[PDB]
């Protein structure tokens, strides 16, 4: 793939479904200027990607005080993301997300950040941290079956923003 | 660029690495087959983010061992740096006597398969990499040269993939 820490990172552009659960199309240039959490995982209706998407949407505020946007992305339709988000939480489902899904049905992205699984045409779990200006800090690339931190994942942001600030900071 | 692939081979390598005894030993990933390995690169010796790492990684290196994991640090320094690093004490700002042994890179080859050489900068970035007792790649983890790495997820993720080996197995 094509993303290197220290440089700028893969940009898309692609259909997601948002919060207010409609579908629109985004592009990781949208939210320059902000820090973002851009984490793939493989499909939709599966059993360890729903513990990991609630609980980014369900901590979506914590990110926020961080001026942090996350997306998550897979290659299933937007569609099907929908599908998913609509299914009663009590039974399965995602329920109300805070947060927006990508759809990459071409798997352009996902080889674009190096995290496609080519003999089946789905991501691996990857999560990058890219800063305000658009730079690749971070890389997480976990195989299928092992999910993801949100608590680590804060941990990052806040000390990449924090070393980040330590030479602008006032003298006194 | 680089060779580390999930659910592929960890790319092997052989090279000095200065053990917890104080000797210089020649060692190989292939060495550790039958174990997880926890296998992390840093910058270079002598620096201020990194030796609190490795102490980190150090101190705790029996909560590896619980989980029949081998710890292994690794920079491009010489094995001579390593061992003078070793052998300056932690209160001077040194390491002090280790628990895990320090692969020397000179070559830059080892951070090169692991796709963590900082292109014109000779250093590689902060890598670690969690490769099964089969030898297979299952987690890549990159930072950036200002942002330390964590024991604790570590260990989660070891725990994790030794937690998912107990079912799907096909042989
Ligand atoms: C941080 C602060 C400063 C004052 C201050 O009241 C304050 O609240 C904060 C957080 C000082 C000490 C004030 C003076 C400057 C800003 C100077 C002066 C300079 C001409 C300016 O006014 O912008 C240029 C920047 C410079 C040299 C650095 C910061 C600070 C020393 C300063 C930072
Ligand atoms: C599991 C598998 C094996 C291959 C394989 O392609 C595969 O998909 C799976 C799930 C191997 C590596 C194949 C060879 C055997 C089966 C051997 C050979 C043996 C003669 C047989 O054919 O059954 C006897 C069993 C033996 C020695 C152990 C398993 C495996 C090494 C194997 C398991």
Redesign the interface.
Known sequence: GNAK??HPAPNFKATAVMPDGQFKDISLSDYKGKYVVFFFYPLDFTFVSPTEIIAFSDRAEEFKKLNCQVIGASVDSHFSHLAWVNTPKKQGGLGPMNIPLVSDPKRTIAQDYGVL?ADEGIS?RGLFIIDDKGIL???????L???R?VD?TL??VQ??QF?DKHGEVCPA
């Not at 800090?137 to 195989?143: A, E, K, S």
Request: charged share 25%; net charge positive; no cysteine.
């Open positions: 820490i220290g699984k691996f800090r971070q890389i997480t690339v976990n195989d079956p092992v999910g931190s680590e941990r990052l000390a990449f070393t």
